Design a protein around this nucleic acid. Structure first.
Lengths: 80, 87, 205, 80
RNA sequence: UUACCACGGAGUGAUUCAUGACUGGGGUGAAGUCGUAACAAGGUAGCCGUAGGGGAACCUGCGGCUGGAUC
RNA sequence: GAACUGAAGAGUUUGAUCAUGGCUCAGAUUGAACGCUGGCGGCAGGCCUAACACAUGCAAGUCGAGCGGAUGAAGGGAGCUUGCUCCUGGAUUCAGCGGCGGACGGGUGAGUAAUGCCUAGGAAUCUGCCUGGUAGUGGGGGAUAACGUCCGGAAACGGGCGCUAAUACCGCAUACGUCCUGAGGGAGAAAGUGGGGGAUCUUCGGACCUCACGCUAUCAGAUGAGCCUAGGUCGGAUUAGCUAGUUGGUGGGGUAAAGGCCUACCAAGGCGACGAUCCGUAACUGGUCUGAGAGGAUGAUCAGUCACACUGGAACUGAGACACGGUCCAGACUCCUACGGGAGGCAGCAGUGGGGAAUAUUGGACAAUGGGCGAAAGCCUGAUCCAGCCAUGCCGCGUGUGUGAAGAAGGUCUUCGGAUUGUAAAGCACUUUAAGUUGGGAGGAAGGGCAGUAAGUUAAUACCUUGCUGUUUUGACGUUACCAACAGAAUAAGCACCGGCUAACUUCGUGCCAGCAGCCGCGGUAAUACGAAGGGUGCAAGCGUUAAUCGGAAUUACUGGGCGUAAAGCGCGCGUAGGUGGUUCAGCAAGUUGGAUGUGAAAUCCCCGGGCUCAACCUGGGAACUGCAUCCAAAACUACUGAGCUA
């Protein structure tokens, strides 16, 4: 229904928002080798639960800060 | 260089700008009277300015002076502040 | 444009019977076909590999009177069309209106056929086509314009076409002086003295 | 305004027209939203003089498209 | 009248381009001077790093290598 | 059925060889330029440099059926006898208020390395004219141009004093929708014009009915625009740190709309070797060139987006602009002046000066297709359609045809016999494309006016709308494509090269001089390499040279190279990021595979056809756009998860 992305969170020293790292694998156009890529996105967290190291999910949603258009779905894995 | 049609339009717009500025100023002060009342926390004269303000802001919103969406937003924020004032 | 000049030199350079002259006389009685033209006609010297292809290229060019720009495009169209680039080649310039008229025998030589065709004296399918390079199709009828029916040149050439080898793929009615193109000839129907594989290899350089 | 007009798409002294659905502000031969048919004023043999694709012509007409004075005549001629 | 702000002005840096007395090496030259350093054991085997010395190729010491001849 | 069929090497290091290795060449192409030469036609292209400055002419006007005034005819009545003057009449077409347009169309690529472009998604929005639906268009008021007069100014023009109209402006009434709301209520508009008319009334204008064009409120659609997210988008690390509205939060303001967009306060955050920041360059894409392909180079014409309009900035009006031919200010330049002040912005179409190797007419018409206005007629349109110049390119045609030994003459070579120029000429017959002249001759035209008829509507047979009938009229180009007749071979061949690469050789003159030259190289007295002649070669209204890209170059090697000695293994360990990881079972499905759906604009590339006498060219359909997104299946391998095993 709605495209939700999964990634590892990296930073939570902000207020009501957490930064998630997205893992991608795009082949090199010529050499055809998969190279791991990074996509850090500023996710919004209405209340704060996610700490550093937890896998979470996020949706492209309302722009609600200057760099925050994605908000959390839930924690799929918690970094105990 | 300059066509007579362009000269007429500039004359027409200048006449309309003076006419519009007077009307746009009327909207601004009427809301301003309300905002001064809420900021002074004077409830009794808050709606008196407010009830005096609601006619004019849609009177020029329908005229196309401030657009109806702007007028609608002003009513809600002003009503909410007066609603918040009446506690 | 077109080559205008002495014709034995074209045959003498290569040493093959180029049909630039009417079959009234054999070429040896007209020209010294056993020497290349010019001052040094009696020398020797082996031709290089590229030279053989180029001489092969100009034989097809000089026989039909075609410049290479059309031939290169004719090669391109032959390279375009499906099948072997070899036999796709010769069919393309065998369907020329001037060459078809020469096969019909309305001209003793393709030079006569070209001038006769270009002078609006030939109508194919009833419409006058005055261009040498028109590509006729299978089933197309090629006729001579009625005002040009009394031309002695076609009258002379039609008999000269008798003692030249009756070509099978087209038939001619003498009384109407009109012929129909049945179908494009295959490799066996044309002379085997040519080497169309030398055509393709040269243009790959 | 969306309009159905003819886009001159032939050659010198040999006009060819594309029956084109487009906004009225765009140029004649420029931007469009959809081509629906064509018109050949100089068709000689097997060339179809006018093909209309009557289906899509009604849809844009039902959407408010206003055909030009040439297309309206050609539209009637197609149906007559 | 205040806020914003263009032009313009001041100071102090950075960078880039062009020039500059003079000076250093490099390359090419029709070939001049001084030697003969390497190529043969090239007539003290050569070369590498480093240090010192000398018009110059170079020389000498220390370590390393054979990409050294005879045997 | 078709959308592919596609790949050459040579010269040059040495006494000679093999390898390595660079250089050069044979090819395709260009918005090309230069030299020699030059007949025509079709199609196309044509300032790549100074986004330099611009004389001159046009490029955005239109509506009287929104409104006020002027000009005021046809047609009638009068003094005179209609020379000359006075009344009715309102046909027109006009400066100005208003409406719409001017934000389209057209030009340029300066800026811009991402607020742009491309791909795929998302939601918060606005959207004139257009379409469909719904509810209305009721009643008043106060002005101002134009107009008359006065003053000031050189001009540009400005300022008072009086008059007047509106579909100009503003109140009041009303609200199917609509806006806000303690969901109880509150708030918000408009404009009339034209044709015709059976009754009724009338101030005698009209009221009233109908039709059409309008206007208001609002919903939906379409179009267009705004915004957001993820990926991609040149070179440089001899540019490694950058950023305090900075990065989040809260309240408030602001936008049509979210958002540090702005602000107040709180926290110290945010980006960056996955290349931030900085420097240089640069519009981006579809596409174009080259290549077997993978790739490389490139972003003309045409199309989509963007940015710009003499430079910088700013807002106003408007649905839409921060507006090429609109406004304001500042600056440089040009110009006028009465010295106080004013006017302008060709990167619109022509054209000019200048720069450059280099790129065109101060053209015709709105006939066609579009655009704006208008009810329509109709007007404007340097958009567009055509024409002028240029071999600039692609394509097509011609400059003759057959016979013709005398192997004529002359030239060249010569062995002095002869050969070559050479059936080539001369001659004899012949046709005459194209060019010239004359004659005929489509189509690009859809339509408009007028009259009649039929249908729809309305109370109406009237008005109006639509379908037909008859007549008259619309072609810029154009003096058309195209077709006939006359005449005469008559009007039409030049360029490069000949030592090898590379097809094509002798002589004469010169003698390391003159010179040639892409490389090897040639020329120092018997030069197939210099200059000339003859001959030949290749090409041909073109031929060569240059400039540039790709190829050859497997010479940046993914396809597809190397590193003992030819250039190349870090002096050697450890180790971070990363890259890759033994074997078994199960799960998952990101990779992987197949299918489906949406999208991947059109044009172009390609395949099959159609129309220009063919071709170039145009065009029908298909294929393709190798990508992205979603969904559905599969679990051999990779990734992940869980559980093991010992190599």
């Amino acid at each position: 229904t709605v495209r939700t992305l999964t990634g590892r969170v990296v930073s939570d020293k902000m207020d009501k928002t957490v930064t998630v790292l997205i893992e991608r694998r795009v082949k090199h156009p010529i050499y055809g080798k998969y190279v791991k890529r990074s996509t850090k996105l500023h996710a919004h967290d209405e209340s704060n639960q996610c700490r550093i190291g937890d896998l979470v999910t996020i949706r492209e949603t309302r722009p609600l800060a200057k760099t925050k258009a994605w908000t959390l779905v839930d924690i799929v894995e918690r970094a105990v | 260089a300059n066509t007579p049609s362009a000269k007429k339009r500039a004359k027409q717009a200048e006449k309309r700008r003076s006419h519009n500025a007077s009307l746009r100023s009327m909207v601004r002060t009427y809301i301003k009277n309300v905002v001064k009342a809420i900021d002074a926390k004077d409830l009794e004269k808050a709606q008196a300015a407010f009830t005096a303000a609601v006619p004019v802001i849609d009177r020029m919103a329908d005229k196309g002076i401030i657009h109806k969406n702007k007028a609608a937003r002003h009513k809600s924020r002003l009503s909410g502040h007066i609603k918040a004032l009446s506690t | 444009a077109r080559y205008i000049g002495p014709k034995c030199k074209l045959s003498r350079r290569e040493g093959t019977d180029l049909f630039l002259k009417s079959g009234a006389r054999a070429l040896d009685s007209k020209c010294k076909a056993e020497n290349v033209p010019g001052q040094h006609g009696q020398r020797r010297g082996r031709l290089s590999d590229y030279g053989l292809q180029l001489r092969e290229k100009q034989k097809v060019r000089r026989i039909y009177g075609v410049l290479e720009r059309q031939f290169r495009g004719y090669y391109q169209e032959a390279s375009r069309r499906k099948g072997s680039t070899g036999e796709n080649l010769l069919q393309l310039l065998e369907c020329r209106l001037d060459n078809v008229v020469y096969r019909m025998g309305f001209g003793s030589t393709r030079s006569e056929s070209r001038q006769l065709v270009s002078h609006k004296a030939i109508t194919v399918n009833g419409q006058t086509v005055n261009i040498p390079s028109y590509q006729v199709k299978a089933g197309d009828v090629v006729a001579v314009r009625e005002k040009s029916k009394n031309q002695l040149r076609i009258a002379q050439a039609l008999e000269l076409c008798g003692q030249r080898g009756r070509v099978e793929w087209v038939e001619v009615d003498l009384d109407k002086k009109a012929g129909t193109f049945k179908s494009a000839p295959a490799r066996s129907d044309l002379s085997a003295d040519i080497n169309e594989n030398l055509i393709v290899e040269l243009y790959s350089k | 305004m969306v309009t159905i007009r003819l886009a001159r798409g032939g050659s010198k002294k040999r006009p060819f027209y594309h029956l084109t659905v487009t906004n009225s502000r765009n140029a004649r031969d420029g931007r469009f939203v959809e081509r629906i048919g064509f018109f050949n004023p100089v068709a000689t043999g097997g060339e179809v003089r006018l093909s209309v694709d009557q289906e899509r012509a009604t849809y844009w007409l039902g959407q408010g498209a206003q055909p030009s004075e040439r297309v309206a005549q050609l539209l009637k001629d197609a149906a007559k």
